[PDB]
Ligand binder design. Sequence first.
Ligand SMILES: [K+]
Ligand SMILES: [K+]
Ligand SMILES: [K+]
Ligand SMILES: [K+]
Ligand SMILES: [K+]
Ligand SMILES: [K+]
Ligand SMILES: [K+]
Ligand SMILES: [K+]
Ligand SMILES: [K+]
Ligand SMILES: [K+]
Ligand SMILES: [K+]
Ligand SMILES: [K+]
Ligand SMILES: [K+]
Ligand SMILES: [K+]
Ligand SMILES: [K+]
Ligand SMILES: [K+]
Ligand SMILES: [K+]
Ligand SMILES: [K+]
Ligand SMILES: [Mg+2]
Ligand SMILES: [Mg+2]
Ligand SMILES: [Mg+2]
Ligand SMILES: [Mg+2]
Ligand SMILES: [Mg+2]
Ligand SMILES: [Mg+2]
Ligand SMILES: [Mg+2]
Ligand SMILES: [Mg+2]
Ligand SMILES: [Mg+2]
Ligand SMILES: [Mg+2]
Ligand SMILES: [Mg+2]
Ligand SMILES: [Mg+2]
Ligand SMILES: [Mg+2]
Ligand SMILES: [Mg+2]
Ligand SMILES: [Mg+2]
Ligand SMILES: [Mg+2]
Ligand SMILES: [Mg+2]
Ligand SMILES: [Mg+2]
Ligand SMILES: [Mg+2]
Ligand SMILES: [Mg+2]
Ligand SMILES: [Mg+2]
Ligand SMILES: [Mg+2]
Ligand SMILES: [Mg+2]
Ligand SMILES: [Mg+2]
Ligand SMILES: [Mg+2]
Ligand SMILES: [Mg+2]
Ligand SMILES: [Mg+2]
Ligand SMILES: [Mg+2]
Ligand SMILES: [Mg+2]
Ligand SMILES: [Mg+2]
Ligand SMILES: [Mg+2]
Ligand SMILES: [Mg+2]
Ligand SMILES: [Mg+2]
Ligand SMILES: [Mg+2]
Ligand SMILES: [Mg+2]
Ligand SMILES: [Mg+2]
Ligand SMILES: [Mg+2]
Ligand SMILES: [Mg+2]
Ligand SMILES: [Mg+2]
Ligand SMILES: [Mg+2]
Ligand SMILES: [Mg+2]
Ligand SMILES: [Mg+2]
Ligand SMILES: [Mg+2]
Ligand SMILES: [Mg+2]
Ligand SMILES: [Mg+2]
Ligand SMILES: [Mg+2]
Ligand SMILES: [Mg+2]
Ligand SMILES: [Mg+2]
Ligand SMILES: [Mg+2]
Ligand SMILES: [Mg+2]
Ligand SMILES: [Mg+2]
Ligand SMILES: [Mg+2]
Ligand SMILES: [Mg+2]
Ligand SMILES: [Mg+2]
Ligand SMILES: [Mg+2]
Ligand SMILES: [Mg+2]
Ligand SMILES: [Mg+2]
Ligand SMILES: [Mg+2]
Ligand SMILES: [Mg+2]
Lengths: 45, 271, 88
Amino acid sequence: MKRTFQPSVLKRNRSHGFRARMATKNGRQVLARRRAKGRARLTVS
Amino acid sequence: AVVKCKPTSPGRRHVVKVVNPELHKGKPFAPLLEKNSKSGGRNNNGRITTRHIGGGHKQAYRIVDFKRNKDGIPAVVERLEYDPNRSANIALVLYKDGERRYILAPKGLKAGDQIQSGVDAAIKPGNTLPMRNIPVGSTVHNVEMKPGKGGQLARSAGTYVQIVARDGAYVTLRLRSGEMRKVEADCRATLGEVGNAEHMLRVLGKAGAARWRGVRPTVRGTAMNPVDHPHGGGEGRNFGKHPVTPWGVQTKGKKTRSNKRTDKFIVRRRS
Amino acid sequence: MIREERLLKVLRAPHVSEKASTAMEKSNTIVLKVAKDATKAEIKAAVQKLFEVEVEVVNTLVVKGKVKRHGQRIGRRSDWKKAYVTLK
RNA sequence: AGGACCGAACCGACUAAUGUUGAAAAAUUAGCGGAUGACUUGUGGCUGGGGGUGAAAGGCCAAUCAAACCGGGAGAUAGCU
RNA sequence: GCUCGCCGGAAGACCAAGGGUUCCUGUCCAACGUUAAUCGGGGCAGGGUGAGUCGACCCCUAAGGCGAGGCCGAAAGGCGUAGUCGAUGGGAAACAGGUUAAUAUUCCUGUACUUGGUGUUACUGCGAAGGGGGGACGGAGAAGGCUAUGUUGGCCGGGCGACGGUUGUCCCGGUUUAAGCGUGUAGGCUGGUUUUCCAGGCAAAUCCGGAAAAUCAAGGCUGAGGCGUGAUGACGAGGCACUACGGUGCUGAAGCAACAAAUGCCCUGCUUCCAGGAAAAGCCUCUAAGCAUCAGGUAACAUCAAAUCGUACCCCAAACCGACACAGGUGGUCAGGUAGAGAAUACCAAGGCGCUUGAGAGAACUCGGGUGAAGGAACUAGGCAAAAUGGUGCCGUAACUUCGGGAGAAGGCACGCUGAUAUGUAGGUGAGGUCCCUCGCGGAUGGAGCUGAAAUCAGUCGAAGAUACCAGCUGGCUGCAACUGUUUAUUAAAAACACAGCACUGUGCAAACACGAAAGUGGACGUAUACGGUGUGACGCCUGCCCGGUGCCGGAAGGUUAAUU
Ligand SMILES: [K+]
Ligand SMILES: [K+]
Ligand SMILES: [K+]
Ligand SMILES: [K+]
Ligand SMILES: [K+]
Ligand SMILES: [K+]
Ligand SMILES: [K+]
Ligand SMILES: [K+]
Ligand SMILES: [K+]
Ligand SMILES: [K+]
Ligand SMILES: [K+]
Ligand SMILES: [K+]
Ligand SMILES: [K+]
Ligand SMILES: [K+]
Ligand SMILES: [K+]
Ligand SMILES: [K+]
Ligand SMILES: [K+]
Ligand SMILES: [K+]
Ligand SMILES: [Mg+2]
Ligand SMILES: [Mg+2]
Ligand SMILES: [Mg+2]
Ligand SMILES: [Mg+2]
Ligand SMILES: [Mg+2]
Ligand SMILES: [Mg+2]
Ligand SMILES: [Mg+2]
Ligand SMILES: [Mg+2]
Ligand SMILES: [Mg+2]
Ligand SMILES: [Mg+2]
Ligand SMILES: [Mg+2]
Ligand SMILES: [Mg+2]
Ligand SMILES: [Mg+2]
Ligand SMILES: [Mg+2]
Ligand SMILES: [Mg+2]
Ligand SMILES: [Mg+2]
Ligand SMILES: [Mg+2]
Ligand SMILES: [Mg+2]
Ligand SMILES: [Mg+2]
Ligand SMILES: [Mg+2]
Ligand SMILES: [Mg+2]
Ligand SMILES: [Mg+2]
Ligand SMILES: [Mg+2]
Ligand SMILES: [Mg+2]
Ligand SMILES: [Mg+2]
Ligand SMILES: [Mg+2]
Ligand SMILES: [Mg+2]
Ligand SMILES: [Mg+2]
Ligand SMILES: [Mg+2]
Ligand SMILES: [Mg+2]
Ligand SMILES: [Mg+2]
Ligand SMILES: [Mg+2]
Ligand SMILES: [Mg+2]
Ligand SMILES: [Mg+2]
Ligand SMILES: [Mg+2]
Ligand SMILES: [Mg+2]
Ligand SMILES: [Mg+2]
Ligand SMILES: [Mg+2]
Ligand SMILES: [Mg+2]
Ligand SMILES: [Mg+2]
Ligand SMILES: [Mg+2]
Ligand SMILES: [Mg+2]
Ligand SMILES: [Mg+2]
Ligand SMILES: [Mg+2]
Ligand SMILES: [Mg+2]
Ligand SMILES: [Mg+2]
Ligand SMILES: [Mg+2]
Ligand SMILES: [Mg+2]
Ligand SMILES: [Mg+2]
Ligand SMILES: [Mg+2]
Ligand SMILES: [Mg+2]
Ligand SMILES: [Mg+2]
Ligand SMILES: [Mg+2]
Ligand SMILES: [Mg+2]
Ligand SMILES: [Mg+2]
Ligand SMILES: [Mg+2]
Ligand SMILES: [Mg+2]
Ligand SMILES: [Mg+2]
Ligand SMILES: [Mg+2]
């Protein structure tokens, strides 16, 4: 059966990538939270 | 011509087609085409703002000359054409200077007919004049509401306006709605009725024919749940409320015109 | 003209393998490990200057580094560029 | 010609049996409907939570829906166990 | 290794997406692998991905995104102009053969092609962010011409048969060759040329559009395939030298024809229909400002350049999505034989597999199947399930009907094989040859050869000839819904939703209405034959009475009545 995760790198990057995060105030707050937590990987990039 | 289809399948039984042999079989005049991509009735917020719009056939926009401002220069009708964007047919006209334009095709217009715009034009179907230069009682179409703006009234197939009176700066027009409306006498109008009056005798015959025209299904409010529509709900077919729009406004008689700016120009409401 | 300083950095090592040896004997082609950012023009100029030979053509590829283990630890070897340098 | 007919691909999902700590958190097998269309499908895009979208079933909106998910107010409050 | 079985419109092959070393080699068997494992997609090490031409990048745009200024908004921000991004679309060019353990249109061999720079030479109006052309477009259908491809014959090589027969009307195998270049054919489209003039193409134009003459009537464009060359080559059944028994090395015959034939190509065509079918650049052409014995353009020749990144491997799957080596899901491409209408189905080819526990036994019972005396729905909520029907041709076919239907109604008959008609017919194809002849990819006339149904008559085997697989059960009465559609992903597919049609009602355009503190945007580049809302639901015959209540619409004398004063 068709499951929910149908991978596309282009859609992944456009939806959740670094530049998508940087494009809005709220995306930049995601990055700030992830840096403050000290994530090794900030984004799907 | 109005042609009944034979009932060779249930979807054809009720089809009534308006078949016009005069219309150009070939392609439109490419310099007056533009792309016109579809909205689905969605605005720039991406939200449906007009329901029941979607799909249907791809359509190129024909640039129609509603202004008819190219005065003094005769034009000959080259051909009538189907326009998917409107009920009326359009005429490709060739001006004597080599310019081609599309106009709304008036009733009776055919290839070879000569048309002209301006103050000095003949009172003939397809000629465009300021309405101060058109006799009172004339039937006109493609009527401007402001001088130089382009025709906005009586553009649909079979429609026309009657110039009922002329009083100084203004003419009184009887619109197809039955409304009596004042417009400035400098506003242009094209003599005659819009052609393709048989348009309204078409019978689509099947659900799919409406889908081809980009009309999606209307779901009745009473078929919904209360959360969705005021009419929604009930165990069985129930109603028991005053009919309203999906947004709760009475939809059987309640007047919604509210334009104090333009009230001065309305002599008599359609009533 | 590419500077000698650049040319002295682009060639990293001769690549030793059966395919490299076969390339040498059968097609007069030397196989080199070259700088990741080395272009075909730079590799050509470097080989001609430093090894004092006439280069017909350079073909290049990037070898992706292998993911490896060293205990309970995942590492990755570096990507590197390989040049097939056909001599005249 | 056809929202025409019979019928594969393709799209569905009417019946039955099986399976029900499954081969599978919805399938398999035998039959079944549509199959040039209001068809179907790839890629990309847009609509965002009292909001969307809905040929309308309160359906669907990431195995979640009469108000998604995540974090926060937060140790809500719990005359109850 | 031999045999057996299974798939073969796939369970083969090639990809995209996704994954990321899973690829190849050596080595190891703890763990992983539902068992063992010497094996592995497992561990460890090493190797492996070669491009001007394939793809990306790149140029160009779609939806859409972002968006200098701008407009708007407590702030955050929203919208949007110029722009700038954004493929799933448009835009230059490479093929065959050989080769690695593992890459190959990338390496090698052979033979090509494209774009751009630079220089030289000859000749020349060049010049864009501007104009025009082009690019550039739908559905359906039909037929012709083809090719891929297949079949058969010929040809060439080999064979003479484990058991009766097999020197033949016998058996087996092969019979392949590209891009490019040249040629210009079946076909498709279009009248051609010159001169003059011009309220159009924001200015200009020699271009496009328009007008008017004259002249010639046959010029142009487009185009599959074929043919020639590419190729005195390559490949080639097999054979012969060597064998690390994995394969290397050498050599090499024929290499034609006929017929059949696509869903591919001509064809972005043609015909036809209505629902009326992207954009922008590359490209072609025109000029402007400007530049002028210069730049620049065109052509030839030479030369240089064409970077960078991807390229292994899986890819209907044990490598992707499903926690699994999971009966699930996953877009594109390729399309052999016999039978067949067929991409169904059966059996096979190429190719790939036997699904990672086996061994016995032959109880109940469960599952999946086969057959069943007599009966035949008595079963049961219900014929649930099963059984049955099932093809083609022909005959024949009721009520009712909106005249289409109902209808494949129903029901019935024939059906294999052999021979003859006819050593193979009707039909298709079409050579030699002979004519005409612009003179060839040409007619015309011939019918050699090839292919080839269908029928009739006669005979003949079986219980049975649509023999398997495959493949409608049929009829009668009636409720509901006109119909095709749609729906509760995962217990409801329906009488529910939708629907064409109908009506009421709003809406005069800065429309009503909707999204939005707003700007705006949708409605619509629409304009009352239009658009929104509501109810009804094809069609036929119709749709009665009630305005007291509640809405809505209209009215405004009078009563009552806000801020305010
Ligand atoms: K129209
Ligand atoms: K409805
Ligand atoms: K209701
Ligand atoms: K909802
Ligand atoms: K109800
Ligand atoms: K209900
Ligand atoms: K909510
Ligand atoms: K074992
Ligand atoms: K390249
Ligand atoms: K690049
Ligand atoms: K024998
Ligand atoms: K080529
Ligand atoms: K050739
Ligand atoms: K490769
Ligand atoms: K792939
Ligand atoms: K019934
Ligand atoms: K159903
Ligand atoms: K009343
Ligand atoms: Mg509507
Ligand atoms: Mg309706
Ligand atoms: Mg309901
Ligand atoms: Mg409500
Ligand atoms: Mg009731
Ligand atoms: Mg009641
Ligand atoms: Mg090379
Ligand atoms: Mg490369
Ligand atoms: Mg049908
Ligand atoms: Mg469904
Ligand atoms: Mg099934
Ligand atoms: Mg049916
Ligand atoms: Mg069918
Ligand atoms: Mg309910
Ligand atoms: Mg869900
Ligand atoms: Mg709530
Ligand atoms: Mg609190
Ligand atoms: Mg608590
Ligand atoms: Mg590994
Ligand atoms: Mg392996
Ligand atoms: Mg084990
Ligand atoms: Mg052991
Ligand atoms: Mg391994
Ligand atoms: Mg390319
Ligand atoms: Mg914006
Ligand atoms: Mg700004
Ligand atoms: Mg844009
Ligand atoms: Mg761009
Ligand atoms: Mg693309
Ligand atoms: Mg390989
Ligand atoms: Mg088409
Ligand atoms: Mg052929
Ligand atoms: Mg012989
Ligand atoms: Mg014998
Ligand atoms: Mg087809
Ligand atoms: Mg590969
Ligand atoms: Mg397994
Ligand atoms: Mg699987
Ligand atoms: Mg599929
Ligand atoms: Mg076959
Ligand atoms: Mg099959
Ligand atoms: Mg048993
Ligand atoms: Mg049985
Ligand atoms: Mg019995
Ligand atoms: Mg018996
Ligand atoms: Mg019996
Ligand atoms: Mg009986
Ligand atoms: Mg009975
Ligand atoms: Mg009984
Ligand atoms: Mg009983
Ligand atoms: Mg049954
Ligand atoms: Mg059965
Ligand atoms: Mg009853
Ligand atoms: Mg129905
Ligand atoms: Mg149905
Ligand atoms: Mg359900
Ligand atoms: Mg169901
Ligand atoms: Mg507006
Ligand atoms: Mg109803």
